[PDB]
PDB file of C-alpha atoms in Angstrom:
ATOM      1  CA  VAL D   2       5.656  16.257  -8.166  1.00 52.84           C
ATOM      2  CA  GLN D   3       5.747  17.834  -4.711  1.00 53.26           C
ATOM      3  CA  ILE D   4       2.375  18.105  -2.978  1.00 47.98           C
ATOM      4  CA  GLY D   5       1.792  19.417   0.522  1.00 46.92           C
ATOM      5  CA  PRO D   6       4.202  20.831   3.134  1.00 49.20           C
ATOM      6  CA  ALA D   7       7.722  19.731   3.956  1.00 47.21           C
ATOM      7  CA  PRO D   8       7.452  16.495   5.963  1.00 47.22           C
ATOM      8  CA  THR D   9       8.664  15.941   9.541  1.00 46.17           C
ATOM      9  CA  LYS D  10       8.776  12.871  11.694  1.00 44.06           C
ATOM     10  CA  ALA D  11       5.971  14.306  13.859  1.00 44.59           C
ATOM     11  CA  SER D  12       3.829  15.183  10.821  1.00 45.60           C
ATOM     12  CA  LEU D  13       4.188  11.694   9.341  1.00 45.19           C
ATOM     13  CA  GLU D  14       3.565   9.928  12.685  1.00 45.50           C
ATOM     14  CA  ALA D  15       0.363  11.972  13.273  1.00 47.89           C
ATOM     15  CA  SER D  16      -3.057  10.453  12.790  1.00 46.62           C
ATOM     16  CA  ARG D  17      -3.686  12.675   9.728  1.00 47.22           C
ATOM     17  CA  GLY D  18      -1.696  14.616   7.207  1.00 49.61           C
ATOM     18  CA  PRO D  19      -2.634  18.098   6.087  1.00 48.09           C
ATOM     19  CA  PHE D  20      -5.648  17.438   3.914  1.00 45.71           C
ATOM     20  CA  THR D  21      -9.307  16.929   4.676  1.00 45.42           C
ATOM     21  CA  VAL D  22     -10.685  13.519   3.546  1.00 47.19           C
ATOM     22  CA  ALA D  23     -13.953  12.877   1.682  1.00 45.89           C
ATOM     23  CA  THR D  24     -15.298   9.557   0.430  1.00 49.19           C
ATOM     24  CA  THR D  25     -17.339   8.305  -2.538  1.00 49.99           C
ATOM     25  CA  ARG D  26     -18.477   4.739  -3.375  1.00 48.81           C
ATOM     26  CA  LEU D  27     -16.870   2.545  -6.019  1.00 49.20           C
ATOM     27  CA  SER D  28     -19.589   0.331  -7.519  1.00 54.97           C
ATOM     28  CA  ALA D  29     -18.979  -3.417  -7.667  1.00 54.57           C
ATOM     29  CA  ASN D  30     -17.606  -4.219 -11.148  1.00 52.66           C
ATOM     30  CA  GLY D  31     -15.375  -7.237 -11.198  1.00 55.36           C
ATOM     31  CA  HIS D  32     -14.857  -6.874  -7.421  1.00 56.42           C
ATOM     32  CA  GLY D  33     -17.004  -6.458  -4.322  1.00 54.62           C
ATOM     33  CA  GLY D  34     -17.190  -2.648  -4.347  1.00 54.60           C
ATOM     34  CA  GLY D  35     -15.198  -0.160  -2.364  1.00 54.11           C
ATOM     35  CA  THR D  36     -14.776   3.171  -0.704  1.00 54.09           C
ATOM     36  CA  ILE D  37     -12.653   5.861  -2.341  1.00 54.44           C
ATOM     37  CA  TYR D  38     -10.983   8.194   0.160  1.00 52.54           C
ATOM     38  CA  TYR D  39      -9.656  11.425  -1.341  1.00 51.19           C
ATOM     39  CA  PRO D  40      -8.350  14.820  -0.260  1.00 56.32           C
ATOM     40  CA  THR D  41     -10.716  17.737  -0.748  1.00 55.34           C
ATOM     41  CA  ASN D  42      -7.958  20.360  -0.717  1.00 57.08           C
ATOM     42  CA  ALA D  43      -4.766  18.926  -2.200  1.00 57.75           C
ATOM     43  CA  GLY D  44      -4.549  21.791  -4.665  1.00 57.54           C
ATOM     44  CA  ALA D  45      -3.471  19.482  -7.527  1.00 56.66           C
ATOM     45  CA  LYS D  46      -4.304  16.073  -8.912  1.00 58.94           C
ATOM     46  CA  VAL D  47      -3.239  13.119  -6.831  1.00 61.58           C
ATOM     47  CA  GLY D  48      -2.192   9.531  -7.604  1.00 60.02           C
ATOM     48  CA  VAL D  49      -4.319   6.463  -6.872  1.00 58.72           C
ATOM     49  CA  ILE D  50      -3.684   3.590  -4.458  1.00 58.32           C
ATOM     50  CA  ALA D  51      -5.812   0.401  -4.395  1.00 58.45           C
ATOM     51  CA  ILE D  52      -5.889  -1.668  -1.206  1.00 59.88           C
ATOM     52  CA  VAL D  53      -7.187  -5.242  -0.869  1.00 57.40           C
ATOM     53  CA  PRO D  54      -7.981  -7.325   2.244  1.00 55.92           C
ATOM     54  CA  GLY D  55      -7.212 -10.859   3.284  1.00 52.95           C
ATOM     55  CA  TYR D  56      -9.010 -14.251   3.181  1.00 54.91           C
ATOM     56  CA  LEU D  57     -12.342 -14.225   5.006  1.00 57.47           C
ATOM     57  CA  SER D  58     -11.982 -10.425   5.507  1.00 55.07           C
ATOM     58  CA  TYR D  59     -13.605  -7.211   4.421  1.00 54.65           C
ATOM     59  CA  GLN D  60     -12.586  -3.590   3.800  1.00 56.39           C
ATOM     60  CA  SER D  61     -12.487  -2.885   7.547  1.00 55.30           C
ATOM     61  CA  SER D  62      -9.275  -4.948   7.869  1.00 56.66           C
ATOM     62  CA  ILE D  63      -7.402  -2.414   5.677  1.00 56.41           C
ATOM     63  CA  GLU D  64      -9.543   0.703   6.170  1.00 55.27           C
ATOM     64  CA  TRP D  65      -7.209   2.712   8.392  1.00 55.66           C
ATOM     65  CA  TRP D  66      -4.932   3.326   5.426  1.00 55.37           C
ATOM     66  CA  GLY D  67      -7.732   5.086   3.503  1.00 54.43           C
ATOM     67  CA  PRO D  68      -7.897   8.295   5.564  1.00 54.94           C
ATOM     68  CA  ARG D  69      -4.227   8.108   6.521  1.00 57.41           C
ATOM     69  CA  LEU D  70      -2.908   8.109   2.990  1.00 63.41           C
ATOM     70  CA  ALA D  71      -5.674  10.279   1.537  1.00 65.78           C
ATOM     71  CA  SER D  72      -4.907  13.014   4.094  1.00 66.09           C
ATOM     72  CA  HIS D  73      -1.379  13.197   2.674  1.00 60.67           C
ATOM     73  CA  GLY D  74      -2.540  13.537  -0.971  1.00 63.41           C
ATOM     74  CA  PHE D  75      -3.686  10.284  -2.607  1.00 63.09           C
ATOM     75  CA  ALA D  76      -6.978   8.866  -3.819  1.00 60.43           C
ATOM     76  CA  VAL D  77      -7.182   5.554  -1.934  1.00 59.33           C
ATOM     77  CA  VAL D  78      -9.690   2.839  -2.725  1.00 60.19           C
ATOM     78  CA  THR D  79     -10.283   0.074  -0.194  1.00 61.74           C
ATOM     79  CA  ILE D  80     -12.198  -2.820  -1.800  1.00 62.51           C
ATOM     80  CA  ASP D  81     -14.133  -5.843  -0.841  1.00 63.74           C
ATOM     81  CA  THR D  82     -13.555  -8.873  -3.003  1.00 63.56           C
ATOM     82  CA  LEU D  83     -15.969 -10.880  -5.146  1.00 60.75           C
ATOM     83  CA  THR D  84     -15.870 -13.507  -2.398  1.00 59.66           C
ATOM     84  CA  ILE D  85     -14.117 -13.692   0.916  1.00 62.48           C
ATOM     85  CA  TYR D  86     -12.465 -16.949  -0.267  1.00 61.34           C
ATOM     86  CA  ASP D  87     -10.719 -15.405  -3.285  1.00 61.99           C
ATOM     87  CA  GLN D  88      -7.040 -16.310  -3.709  1.00 65.21           C
ATOM     88  CA  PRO D  89      -4.113 -13.916  -4.356  1.00 63.09           C
ATOM     89  CA  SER D  90      -4.276 -13.956  -8.172  1.00 58.03           C
ATOM     90  CA  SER D  91      -7.982 -13.045  -8.104  1.00 57.61           C
ATOM     91  CA  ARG D  92      -7.341 -10.361  -5.511  1.00 55.32           C
ATOM     92  CA  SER D  93      -4.660  -8.903  -7.837  1.00 60.71           C
ATOM     93  CA  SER D  94      -7.093  -8.769 -10.757  1.00 60.74           C
ATOM     94  CA  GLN D  95      -9.678  -7.033  -8.585  1.00 59.69           C
ATOM     95  CA  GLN D  96      -7.076  -4.559  -7.288  1.00 58.62           C
ATOM     96  CA  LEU D  97      -6.054  -3.601 -10.837  1.00 56.57           C
ATOM     97  CA  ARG D  98      -9.682  -3.120 -11.858  1.00 52.44           C
ATOM     98  CA  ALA D  99     -10.216  -0.827  -8.867  1.00 50.40           C
ATOM     99  CA  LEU D 100      -7.177   1.302  -9.850  1.00 52.65           C
ATOM    100  CA  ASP D 101      -8.458   1.622 -13.422  1.00 50.36           C
ATOM    101  CA  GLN D 102     -12.007   2.437 -12.331  1.00 51.64           C
ATOM    102  CA  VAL D 103     -10.952   5.184  -9.919  1.00 49.61           C
ATOM    103  CA  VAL D 104      -8.820   6.707 -12.642  1.00 50.84           C
ATOM    104  CA  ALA D 105     -11.831   6.656 -14.964  1.00 49.50           C
ATOM    105  CA  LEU D 106     -14.001   8.515 -12.395  1.00 49.33           C
ATOM    106  CA  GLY D 107     -11.433  11.323 -12.460  1.00 48.53           C
ATOM    107  CA  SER D 108     -12.550  12.022 -16.042  1.00 48.99           C
ATOM    108  CA  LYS D 109     -16.276  11.772 -15.304  1.00 49.49           C
ATOM    109  CA  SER D 110     -17.807  15.246 -14.822  1.00 49.18           C
ATOM    110  CA  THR D 111     -20.541  13.900 -12.527  1.00 50.47           C
ATOM    111  CA  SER D 112     -18.042  12.206 -10.160  1.00 49.25           C
ATOM    112  CA  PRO D 113     -16.751  13.966  -7.015  1.00 48.62           C
ATOM    113  CA  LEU D 114     -13.323  12.777  -8.235  1.00 50.22           C
ATOM    114  CA  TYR D 115     -13.560  14.797 -11.433  1.00 52.99           C
ATOM    115  CA  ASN D 116     -10.237  16.494 -12.189  1.00 51.70           C
ATOM    116  CA  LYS D 117      -8.736  15.377  -8.866  1.00 46.28           C
ATOM    117  CA  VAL D 118      -6.795  12.273  -9.960  1.00 46.95           C
ATOM    118  CA  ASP D 119      -3.701  11.503 -12.038  1.00 47.70           C
ATOM    119  CA  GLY D 120      -3.808   8.023 -13.566  1.00 46.10           C
ATOM    120  CA  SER D 121      -0.133   8.187 -14.494  1.00 43.71           C
ATOM    121  CA  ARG D 122       0.795   7.662 -10.792  1.00 44.60           C
ATOM    122  CA  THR D 123      -0.537   4.509  -9.055  1.00 47.24           C
ATOM    123  CA  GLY D 124       0.270   2.196  -6.128  1.00 46.52           C
ATOM    124  CA  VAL D 125      -0.897  -1.078  -4.595  1.00 45.07           C
ATOM    125  CA  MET D 126      -1.252  -2.205  -0.981  1.00 46.60           C
ATOM    126  CA  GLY D 127      -2.994  -5.022   0.854  1.00 46.94           C
ATOM    127  CA  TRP D 128      -2.953  -7.480   3.694  1.00 47.84           C
ATOM    128  CA  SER D 129      -2.346 -11.213   3.818  1.00 47.10           C
ATOM    129  CA  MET D 130      -3.689 -12.838   0.615  1.00 49.06           C
ATOM    130  CA  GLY D 131      -4.212  -9.241  -0.518  1.00 47.77           C
ATOM    131  CA  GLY D 132      -0.537  -8.617   0.197  1.00 47.70           C
ATOM    132  CA  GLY D 133       0.382 -11.528  -2.060  1.00 52.80           C
ATOM    133  CA  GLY D 134      -2.108 -10.067  -4.515  1.00 52.77           C
ATOM    134  CA  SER D 135      -0.298  -6.698  -4.395  1.00 52.58           C
ATOM    135  CA  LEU D 136       3.064  -8.342  -5.220  1.00 50.89           C
ATOM    136  CA  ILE D 137       1.276 -10.122  -8.108  1.00 52.54           C
ATOM    137  CA  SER D 138      -0.150  -6.794  -9.310  1.00 52.37           C
ATOM    138  CA  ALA D 139       3.315  -5.203  -9.282  1.00 51.67           C
ATOM    139  CA  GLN D 140       4.683  -8.241 -11.158  1.00 54.52           C
ATOM    140  CA  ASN D 141       1.978  -8.177 -13.791  1.00 56.01           C
ATOM    141  CA  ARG D 142       1.679  -4.392 -14.287  1.00 59.44           C
ATOM    142  CA  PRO D 143       5.182  -2.863 -13.938  1.00 60.87           C
ATOM    143  CA  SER D 144       3.858   0.623 -14.720  1.00 60.14           C
ATOM    144  CA  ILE D 145       2.629   0.685 -11.102  1.00 60.49           C
ATOM    145  CA  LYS D 146       4.836   3.135  -9.228  1.00 58.85           C
ATOM    146  CA  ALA D 147       4.969   1.551  -5.771  1.00 60.72           C
ATOM    147  CA  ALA D 148       3.815  -1.448  -3.720  1.00 61.11           C
ATOM    148  CA  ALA D 149       3.587  -1.765   0.059  1.00 63.43           C
ATOM    149  CA  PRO D 150       1.930  -5.063   1.112  1.00 62.79           C
ATOM    150  CA  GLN D 151       1.553  -6.063   4.781  1.00 61.57           C
ATOM    151  CA  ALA D 152       1.883  -9.550   6.245  1.00 62.93           C
ATOM    152  CA  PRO D 153       1.874 -10.888   2.725  1.00 59.22           C
ATOM    153  CA  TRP D 154       0.765 -14.479   2.095  1.00 56.14           C
ATOM    154  CA  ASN D 155       1.387 -16.372  -1.161  1.00 53.63           C
ATOM    155  CA  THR D 156       2.064 -20.022  -2.039  1.00 54.05           C
ATOM    156  CA  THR D 157       5.042 -19.101  -4.248  1.00 53.58           C
ATOM    157  CA  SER D 158       7.883 -16.657  -3.675  1.00 52.94           C
ATOM    158  CA  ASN D 159       9.437 -15.876  -7.055  1.00 53.30           C
ATOM    159  CA  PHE D 160       9.102 -12.085  -7.283  1.00 53.71           C
ATOM    160  CA  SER D 161      12.479 -11.700  -9.004  1.00 55.92           C
ATOM    161  CA  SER D 162      10.953  -9.941 -12.032  1.00 54.89           C
ATOM    162  CA  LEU D 163       9.691  -6.974  -9.921  1.00 58.40           C
ATOM    163  CA  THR D 164      10.860  -3.509 -11.005  1.00 61.95           C
ATOM    164  CA  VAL D 165       8.299  -1.717  -8.851  1.00 61.75           C
ATOM    165  CA  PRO D 166       9.601  -0.113  -5.636  1.00 60.09           C
ATOM    166  CA  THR D 167       8.328  -2.499  -2.971  1.00 57.65           C
ATOM    167  CA  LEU D 168       8.116  -2.113   0.818  1.00 58.52           C
ATOM    168  CA  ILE D 169       7.168  -5.281   2.710  1.00 62.54           C
ATOM    169  CA  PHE D 170       5.664  -4.938   6.191  1.00 63.20           C
ATOM    170  CA  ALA D 171       6.245  -8.243   8.025  1.00 64.67           C
ATOM    171  CA  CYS D 172       4.858  -9.578  11.316  1.00 65.84           C
ATOM    172  CA  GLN D 173       7.675 -11.323  13.183  1.00 63.94           C
ATOM    173  CA  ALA D 174       5.562 -13.976  14.969  1.00 62.64           C
ATOM    174  CA  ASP D 175       3.066 -14.495  12.126  1.00 58.87           C
ATOM    175  CA  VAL D 176       1.561 -18.028  12.231  1.00 61.69           C
ATOM    176  CA  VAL D 177      -0.577 -17.592   9.079  1.00 58.43           C
ATOM    177  CA  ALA D 178       2.151 -16.313   6.730  1.00 57.07           C
ATOM    178  CA  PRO D 179       5.289 -17.176   8.760  1.00 61.57           C
ATOM    179  CA  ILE D 180       8.003 -14.776   7.736  1.00 58.52           C
ATOM    180  CA  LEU D 181      10.652 -17.439   7.042  1.00 58.30           C
ATOM    181  CA  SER D 182       8.411 -18.968   4.305  1.00 56.46           C
ATOM    182  CA  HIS D 183       6.465 -15.873   3.060  1.00 59.17           C
ATOM    183  CA  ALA D 184       7.695 -12.291   3.697  1.00 54.63           C
ATOM    184  CA  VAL D 185      11.432 -13.032   3.879  1.00 55.66           C
ATOM    185  CA  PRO D 186      11.582 -15.214   0.711  1.00 57.52           C
ATOM    186  CA  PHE D 187       9.429 -12.627  -1.133  1.00 60.33           C
ATOM    187  CA  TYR D 188      11.861  -9.876  -0.143  1.00 58.44           C
ATOM    188  CA  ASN D 189      14.957 -11.926  -0.903  1.00 59.19           C
ATOM    189  CA  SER D 190      13.713 -12.811  -4.404  1.00 62.11           C
ATOM    190  CA  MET D 191      13.798  -9.134  -5.495  1.00 61.19           C
ATOM    191  CA  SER D 192      16.964  -7.682  -7.097  1.00 58.99           C
ATOM    192  CA  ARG D 193      15.901  -5.168  -9.753  1.00 58.28           C
ATOM    193  CA  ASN D 194      13.967  -2.664  -7.657  1.00 60.57           C
ATOM    194  CA  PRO D 195      14.150  -0.273  -4.722  1.00 61.40           C
ATOM    195  CA  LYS D 196      12.930  -2.486  -1.894  1.00 59.50           C
ATOM    196  CA  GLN D 197      12.483  -2.432   1.863  1.00 65.00           C
ATOM    197  CA  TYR D 198      11.593  -4.821   4.676  1.00 65.93           C
ATOM    198  CA  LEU D 199      10.211  -3.637   8.022  1.00 67.37           C
ATOM    199  CA  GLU D 200       9.321  -6.242  10.649  1.00 64.98           C
ATOM    200  CA  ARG D 201       7.154  -5.644  13.725  1.00 65.36           C
ATOM    201  CA  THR D 202       8.468  -7.265  16.914  1.00 68.87           C
ATOM    202  CA  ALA D 203       6.360 -10.239  18.075  1.00 71.96           C
ATOM    203  CA  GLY D 204       3.647  -9.274  15.616  1.00 72.95           C
ATOM    204  CA  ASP D 205       0.818 -11.634  14.801  1.00 69.05           C
ATOM    205  CA  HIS D 206      -0.658 -11.815  11.291  1.00 67.83           C
ATOM    206  CA  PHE D 207      -2.968  -8.856  11.993  1.00 69.75           C
ATOM    207  CA  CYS D 208      -0.143  -6.637  13.335  1.00 68.26           C
ATOM    208  CA  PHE D 209      -0.437  -3.910  10.655  1.00 67.37           C
ATOM    209  CA  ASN D 210      -4.243  -3.684  10.655  1.00 66.70           C
ATOM    210  CA  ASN D 211      -4.626  -1.023  13.393  1.00 66.54           C
ATOM    211  CA  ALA D 212      -2.761   2.249  12.665  1.00 64.88           C
ATOM    212  CA  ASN D 213       0.774   2.165  14.120  1.00 68.91           C
ATOM    213  CA  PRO D 214       2.536   5.600  13.823  1.00 71.17           C
ATOM    214  CA  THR D 215       5.817   4.242  12.365  1.00 70.98           C
ATOM    215  CA  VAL D 216       3.895   2.042   9.928  1.00 69.69           C
ATOM    216  CA  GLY D 217       1.893   5.086   8.873  1.00 68.49           C
ATOM    217  CA  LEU D 218       5.030   7.188   8.491  1.00 71.76           C
ATOM    218  CA  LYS D 219       6.614   4.481   6.334  1.00 74.53           C
ATOM    219  CA  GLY D 220       3.658   3.786   4.108  1.00 74.73           C
ATOM    220  CA  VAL D 221       3.093   7.479   3.386  1.00 73.61           C
ATOM    221  CA  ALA D 222       6.800   8.152   2.884  1.00 73.01           C
ATOM    222  CA  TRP D 223       7.197   5.196   0.498  1.00 70.62           C
ATOM    223  CA  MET D 224       4.179   6.262  -1.565  1.00 70.44           C
ATOM    224  CA  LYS D 225       5.234   9.947  -1.602  1.00 71.84           C
ATOM    225  CA  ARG D 226       8.749   9.061  -2.684  1.00 70.12           C
ATOM    226  CA  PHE D 227       7.843   6.483  -5.385  1.00 66.15           C
ATOM    227  CA  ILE D 228       4.295   7.383  -6.584  1.00 66.14           C
ATOM    228  CA  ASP D 229       4.944  11.127  -6.632  1.00 66.24           C
ATOM    229  CA  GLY D 230       8.707  11.089  -7.122  1.00 64.32           C
ATOM    230  CA  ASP D 231       8.854  13.535  -4.202  1.00 66.73           C
ATOM    231  CA  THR D 232      12.485  13.541  -3.147  1.00 69.18           C
ATOM    232  CA  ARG D 233      11.678  15.444   0.046  1.00 72.28           C
ATOM    233  CA  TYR D 234      10.593  11.987   1.229  1.00 72.12           C
ATOM    234  CA  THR D 235      13.776  10.107   0.297  1.00 69.20           C
ATOM    235  CA  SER D 236      15.175  10.171   3.816  1.00 67.89           C
ATOM    236  CA  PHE D 237      11.921   9.034   5.443  1.00 67.29           C
ATOM    237  CA  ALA D 238      11.331   6.365   2.751  1.00 68.50           C
ATOM    238  CA  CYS D 239      14.859   4.964   2.702  1.00 67.90           C
ATOM    239  CA  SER D 240      16.092   5.302   6.339  1.00 70.16           C
ATOM    240  CA  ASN D 241      15.800   2.883   9.213  1.00 70.23           C
ATOM    241  CA  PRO D 242      13.001   4.553  11.287  1.00 66.03           C
ATOM    242  CA  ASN D 243      14.924   3.679  14.478  1.00 63.63           C
ATOM    243  CA  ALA D 244      11.638   2.913  16.159  1.00 65.71           C
ATOM    244  CA  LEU D 245      10.726   0.888  19.212  1.00 66.21           C
ATOM    245  CA  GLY D 246       8.836  -2.260  18.413  1.00 68.44           C
ATOM    246  CA  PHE D 247      10.517  -3.310  15.167  1.00 65.51           C
ATOM    247  CA  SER D 248      12.716  -6.403  15.002  1.00 64.13           C
ATOM    248  CA  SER D 249      14.253  -6.120  11.508  1.00 67.42           C
ATOM    249  CA  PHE D 250      14.906  -3.465   8.879  1.00 65.47           C
ATOM    250  CA  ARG D 251      16.519  -4.007   5.483  1.00 65.35           C
ATOM    251  CA  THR D 252      16.610  -1.868   2.336  1.00 64.77           C
ATOM    252  CA  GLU D 253      18.327  -1.886  -1.067  1.00 65.31           C
ATOM    253  CA  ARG D 254      18.490   0.440  -4.056  1.00 66.49           C
ATOM    254  CA  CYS D 255      16.947   3.188  -1.870  1.00 63.53           C
ATOM    255  CA  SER D 256      19.769   5.694  -1.690  1.00 64.07           C
ATOM    256  CA  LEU D 257      20.086   8.858   0.463  1.00 63.80           C
TER     257      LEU D 257
END
């Protein structure tokens, strides 16, 4: 599907895409509740992205993605977890529940999301333990169309089964999830999928939590290309962004 205008570097670096963003609450049901960001004027049904925070953290740590992605044509739910101590596998379960519940609101005539969402097109994102959780979600539910975790943290690194297109945002100087034992092994384990690695120069573990323009371009382009199948975004999704402030870029099985 092709939603919205032809993309440009400027339009993807901008604070917002073309659409106006509303919100509605996701009640706590097997997670800590969330906010659903959605476009009011996409003109067609949109896919769903669920985003999960890190250890000891709340929705605010991942919130900037909500309006950013929603304004380009996605329903984006940012959740709190059952507890702030929850580990990656629990965060994955909660993320999948949030996806399913947003999809179900799209079929509820009393929901603001009624007739606005397409449950056949879904993605997962998240930070830190929620980034590990997003890789776990993609591993456990291969019908997901795209994953784009940031500063992912996980105690194991065998993501070789993944078939989901996966972009890893990595923080070069991360002390919490050091890249040589977390992000890089996670990336290297993958061989069956379109995949990408983008590393922020001298970044600490929180380096993706505050709305960088290249990060925003990449996350939207990856989700457009792989959730929507929108080949207008292939060049933005697959290319080195050639941006100041990034120390490494790698991609495979992301052609043209």
